[PDB]
């Protein structure tokens, strides 16, 4: 606090590490699905969320949430992954963009179509 103590050692600012290290300062990355599975949420929640392990183009292996109702993804499927974690899913820190490359948009969606890659009918 002393102005002399500050002169020798200036105040230091911490730099928080990104919560999406596998994305590497890019808005989205392309990867392929190595394993499609369902997992169980934490204490409060109880469901079967669809998550897939993705091998990204920079070599990172991550698991990203598959949003929406129903998906057509299996092994060896090219997907685009976006940031944003899932709070009730441990270890999931990315989202799979529906409507790009192989992952088709959710069928029969009417509200919030752009967020889930849904065509206008």
């Amino acid at each position: 606090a002393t102005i002399n103590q500050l002169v020798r050692k200036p105040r230091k600012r911490m730099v928080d590490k990104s919560d999406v290290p596998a994305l590497q300062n890019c808005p989205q990355r392309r990867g392929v699905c190595t394993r499609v599975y369902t997992t169980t949420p934490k204490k409060p929640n109880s469901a079967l969320r669809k998550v897939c392990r993705v091998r990204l183009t920079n070599g990172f292996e991550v698991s990203s949430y598959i949003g929406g109702e129903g998906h057509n993804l299996q092994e060896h499927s090219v997907v685009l992954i976006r940031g944003g974690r899932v709070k009730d899913l441990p270890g999931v820190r990315y989202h799979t963009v529906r409507g790009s490359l192989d992952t088709s948009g959710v069928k029969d969606r009417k509200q919030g179509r752009s967020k889930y890659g849904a065509k206008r009918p």
Partner: protein, 80 residues
Amino acid sequence: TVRTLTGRVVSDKMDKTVTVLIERRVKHPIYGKYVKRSTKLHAHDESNQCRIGDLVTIRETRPLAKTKAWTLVDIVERAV
């Protein structure tokens, strides 16, 4: 006319040259406190008079060694 600097000499174990310490006081850009700074310069002394501890004056002058661009004006105070 010509900018001459004043400082305390620190070393004279060389031949025909003496090293002078320059005292500066630059404020910290943020904390605004004067911190004493050091500027050791290799001054040239055509003949040797200055011993350690004497205040002398020097001019930016001809580069006449690889680290010697300043030469003496005179002794303003002698460390008796």
